[PDB]
Write a protein that binds this ligand. Structure first.
Ligand code: HEM
Ligand code: HEM
Ligand code: HEM
Ligand SMILES: [Fe+2]
Ligand SMILES: [Fe+2]
Ligand SMILES: [Fe+2]
Ligand SMILES: [Fe+2]
Ligand SMILES: [Fe+2]
Ligand SMILES: [Fe+2]
Ligand SMILES: [Fe+2]
Ligand SMILES: [Fe+2]
Ligand SMILES: [Fe+2]
Ligand SMILES: [Fe+2]
Ligand SMILES: [Fe+2]
Ligand SMILES: [Fe+2]
Ligand SMILES: [Fe+2]
Ligand SMILES: [Fe+2]
Ligand SMILES: [Fe+2]
Ligand SMILES: [Fe+2]
Ligand SMILES: [Fe+2]
Ligand SMILES: [Fe+2]
Ligand SMILES: [Fe+2]
Ligand SMILES: [Fe+2]
Ligand SMILES: [Fe+2]
Ligand SMILES: [Fe+2]
Ligand SMILES: [Fe+2]
Ligand SMILES: [Fe+2]
Ligand SMILES: [Fe+2]
Ligand SMILES: [Fe+2]
Ligand SMILES: [Fe+2]
Ligand SMILES: [Fe+2]
Ligand SMILES: [Fe+2]
Ligand SMILES: [Fe+2]
Ligand SMILES: [Fe+2]
Ligand SMILES: [Fe+2]
Ligand SMILES: [Fe+2]
Ligand SMILES: [Fe+2]
Ligand SMILES: [Fe+2]
Ligand SMILES: [Fe+2]
Ligand SMILES: [Fe+2]
Ligand SMILES: [Fe+2]
Ligand SMILES: [Fe+2]
Ligand SMILES: [Fe+2]
Ligand SMILES: [Fe+2]
Ligand SMILES: [Fe+2]
Ligand SMILES: [Fe+2]
Ligand SMILES: [Fe+2]
Ligand SMILES: [Fe+2]
Ligand SMILES: [Fe+2]
Ligand SMILES: [Fe+2]
Ligand SMILES: [Fe+2]
Ligand SMILES: [Fe+2]
Ligand SMILES: [Fe+2]
Ligand SMILES: [Fe+2]
Ligand SMILES: [Fe+2]
Ligand SMILES: [Fe+2]
Ligand SMILES: [Fe+2]
Ligand SMILES: [Fe+2]
Ligand SMILES: [Fe+2]
Ligand SMILES: [Fe+2]
Ligand SMILES: [Fe+2]
Ligand SMILES: [Fe+2]
Ligand SMILES: [Fe+2]
Ligand SMILES: [Fe+2]
Ligand SMILES: [Fe+2]
Ligand SMILES: [Fe+2]
Ligand SMILES: [Fe+2]
Ligand SMILES: [K+]
Lengths: 156, 156, 156, 156, 156, 156, 156
């Protein structure tokens, strides 16, 4: 089925965001694991897997619409040097991603691509859960202190 | 994540409706049970539990959006004195609730809060099922007669 | 069997205290969950459920005695802004509520409503366990430190 | 142990009431069964078994207190001729029984026989459940009509 | 079905004997239990249950024959003060009961109420088993001595 | 938040009685076991465990009320030299315990400490069971003779 | 056939030490439980049970040797006011106990009561495990800090 070219362009923009998030989260996960903060590593890995699944659904939708998925362009990773920086960088990336998702949903509604809208809404629900996770961890660092927070995320 | 203040105000309005419905339905349930109309009591209890779960989701969403859930303000319960009045009072309350849900959905769409919209749509689907249940019971009272209808709802 | 009018007034007063506690504890529970303090959130949810069950038993007893349960009047919630304030606010509520239970039991005894007395005694046993829980947590904060206490109530 | 002679007199009065209820409810049960109203018959049999178990506990307590259980004196049975009369006669009997139970509890409290008081309170809780059952059935006859009420209690 | 009025009178006489035996044996059972003679108490309870089941069948038959079961008139209980007296009092009661059963069977045969006769014969077989039990226990007291007999019926 | 000072004194008095009974019954148990009267020894051990559990509940209650449990003061043990004396000494001790329990319950009721009252009533129910056990054993010695009574309590 | 009088005196001295430890550790256990330090409370309860089992074995041995177990004389409990004092007071008590055990073993060896010696050696092995437990906890307080130590012993 021949999709709207601007919808396909929006879907490729979302896909591009997923690709940044996959790599940033995977590396953050393996950094936490390397440091012996295995619970943080495992949860960051789970976030990376979520983004892999979002990318998959986007690729499948673009192909159905007769578009060309762009897996070539990888935007800027902002890798942190410590736990607080890593969490904040992830959170900043998620906030950029939801902004793009909302603009893509607007466009899908405008051209009556309600199935793409619903896919993007499902991804946006997941991203807001990611934002909730990351905001909550930064808040816990303040409430229990950094050393305790890290201690609680050492052992799986 | 910092939510739109008018969306949060709409969510608290919906929450307020849930709180009325929880108490009205719980008391109606226990009145039917007290009268020995246990099947009616059990179904009304189920409705009250549905509204408890709606309230829960609304509270969680308001907190995520950095709003303050209002569990203090309880609107007017209209407790019936017999089965027909109790069902009709519930139905009137549901019809008020769906009106508020539609206005809240309009606002979420306007400001691109698509995750809150989808939550409210899910609640609205449940409320229309509640309306269907209550309308159907009032119709059955007409078709089988009040005495038979009550008889059929005595024993679980 | 018509119950004593002042006994029914007392039961409605106890019921009113339960309705305050249901909402305050439910909101405190969801606040703790929102902050990622899930062990605190779960325990507070089970306190809320306990009060819901108290309210149910009182409603059933009032109806049996041919009184009108009052679910319309909701007294003042006191929502804390951090863990210490939330625990202290719950403790304030419980201490005020047990004072009313004792006065209600006195009245039941005076008019020989021994079944209502035993119901209120069972609720009072639960409220003193709730007081014990709350006082103990506040004491643990003093013994292990606030940051450690919150750490220990982060993960379920 | 040597019980208070007036307490033993109260316990024998309660036992006397149980013996009336056992026989009245057993006969009402078998009359309902005879008429093909088997659900009514089964519930009335259950009430009769409850009173047998009350009598057993009272006999045991009287003997422990070195009293003589009185199973010789059987008071007045009032056997109804139709369902409404039978239920109302049972209800009248239960209301007489609770009046005697409250006077007995007063006396146990006066002489500090707290264990006998707790037994009598357990019996009283059961009789108030019996009263609730009987009142509820009389109310259902009004709400669903006598013919429907009987129909619903034909088949087990 | 319309029973013979003299047969119904006989059945009510048998029922009257059952009602005496129920109460006498239940009290003897609880006296033996009170004394710590639990095997004697359990067997006497079993005898009491047998008489309850006899009474039930007689009530059912009387009602089928369109008679009025008489549970109002309770004849003389003869409660013993020690084991030998209790057993002998039960035995005396059983011998009175079989005398009445034989006269009732004669009358059933005379008027061709063969189904009532067979019920009464089944009851009589049970009473002769009861007589055998009681006679045997009195004989064992002579053969093993009273102290040994009681010792053997202390523990269940 | 403290209990009533005189209630705490009563609870410590009850606790003192438990501590006497624990030690007296444990030694009596082990004397019976040493003599080869293992069924008596096992039952007496069970009585001692009951008193340990009573003491535990009292200690927990005193601490909740912010009293100081007194485990220092051990009153007079009266150890018997043979089975009859041991049983009688236990019985005398239980009768002193129930006297103190009734005085403590009066006080709890007076100051509206209804949870302490219910705890003491539960302990009192258990002590009256203990009295029943002891009185019954002494009575069995009379009915079956001492040698037979001891014989029946040799083997478990 | 009697044990040595001075061996029996030593065994009663060891028994006296057990009785102190039972009560001291049981109260310390219930204080820790009351404070919400349930893992400390559970371990201390376990220590108290060990001492109850030691006392049982000593009572059995004394009775076999035809001595009189002394459960009347309770020496001085030293109840701590906080975790460090409670642990230290337990440790001081264990060190007194092992001193008396070694003197008792010397005496058993001197008079060739090798079975009493082996029993006391088994108790001594257990007391040195108790000492190891207590010393290790005090050392952990130093290594992890008091607040962390207490935190780690809050939850079971
Ligand atoms: C009149 C006030 C209320 C009464 C008497 C009441 C009663 C109950 C009862 C009896 C249950 C079942 C508990 C059990 O058996 O475990 C229940 C479930 C529940 N209630 Fe309430 N309730 C009240 C109000 C509320 C409110 C105001 C909220 C939240 C804002 C709430 C949240 C819940 C939740 C989340 C459940 C669990 C439902 C499930 O099974 O998923 N309730 N309620
Ligand atoms: C002093 C009066 C009586 C006492 C204390 C007494 C006591 C009892 C008790 C304790 C049970 C066992 C109930 C249970 O544990 O579920 C029982 C069973 C029963 N009783 Fe009675 N009873 C009395 C008189 C009667 C009478 C007068 C009747 C009928 C006319 C009757 C009919 C029955 C029947 C049919 C059962 C069930 C037996 C079975 O099949 O297991 N009882 N009774
Ligand atoms: C302050 C006084 C005491 C208290 C509060 C106390 C408490 C307890 C409790 C709660 C139990 C567990 C019972 C159960 O749950 O079944 C127990 C077990 C036991 N107690 Fe005590 N106790 C006390 C004194 C004693 C004394 C003085 C002795 C012996 C001289 C003793 C001997 C025993 C024995 C043999 C057990 C069973 C241990 C096992 O499980 O193998 N107790 N105690
Ligand atoms: Fe590694
Ligand atoms: Fe997830
Ligand atoms: Fe994503
Ligand atoms: Fe295709
Ligand atoms: Fe666009
Ligand atoms: Fe979808
Ligand atoms: Fe994401
Ligand atoms: Fe590790
Ligand atoms: Fe592990
Ligand atoms: Fe009811
Ligand atoms: Fe549903
Ligand atoms: Fe709802
Ligand atoms: Fe948040
Ligand atoms: Fe709006
Ligand atoms: Fe959704
Ligand atoms: Fe609804
Ligand atoms: Fe029914
Ligand atoms: Fe059913
Ligand atoms: Fe969350
Ligand atoms: Fe609980
Ligand atoms: Fe409550
Ligand atoms: Fe009612
Ligand atoms: Fe009052
Ligand atoms: Fe109760
Ligand atoms: Fe509470
Ligand atoms: Fe404090
Ligand atoms: Fe975590
Ligand atoms: Fe987990
Ligand atoms: Fe029939
Ligand atoms: Fe029942
Ligand atoms: Fe009864
Ligand atoms: Fe007795
Ligand atoms: Fe009286
Ligand atoms: Fe009780
Ligand atoms: Fe009753
Ligand atoms: Fe049928
Ligand atoms: Fe059936
Ligand atoms: Fe007994
Ligand atoms: Fe049999
Ligand atoms: Fe019979
Ligand atoms: Fe018939
Ligand atoms: Fe005849
Ligand atoms: Fe037959
Ligand atoms: Fe018989
Ligand atoms: Fe025994
Ligand atoms: Fe047995
Ligand atoms: Fe032995
Ligand atoms: Fe027991
Ligand atoms: Fe006790
Ligand atoms: Fe406390
Ligand atoms: Fe006092
Ligand atoms: Fe209780
Ligand atoms: Fe006791
Ligand atoms: Fe043997
Ligand atoms: Fe054996
Ligand atoms: Fe506690
Ligand atoms: Fe151990
Ligand atoms: Fe020891
Ligand atoms: Fe010996
Ligand atoms: Fe020595
Ligand atoms: Fe050994
Ligand atoms: Fe030790
Ligand atoms: Fe905790
Ligand atoms: Fe746990
Ligand atoms: K820590």
């Amino acid at each position: 089925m021949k999709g709207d070219k601007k919808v396909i362009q929006h879907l490729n923009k979302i896909l591009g965001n997923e690709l940044i998030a996959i790599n940033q989260y995977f590396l953050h996960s393996r950094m936490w694991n390397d440091w012996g903060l295995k619970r943080l590593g495992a949860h960051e890995y789970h976030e990376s897997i979520d983004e892999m699944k979002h990318a998959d659904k986007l690729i499948e939708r673009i192909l159905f619409l007769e578009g060309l998925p762009n897996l070539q362009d990888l935007g800027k990773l902002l890798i942190g040097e410590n736990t607080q920086e890593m969490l904040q960088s992830d959170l900043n990336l998620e906030l950029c991603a939801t902004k793009d998702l909302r603009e893509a949903i607007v466009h899908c509604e405008q051209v009556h691509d309600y199935v793409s809208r619903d896919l993007l809404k499902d991804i946006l629900e997941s991203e807001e859960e990611h934002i909730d996770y990351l905001e909550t961890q930064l808040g816990l660092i303040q409430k229990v202190g950094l050393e305790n927070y890290l201690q609680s995320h050492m052992h799986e």
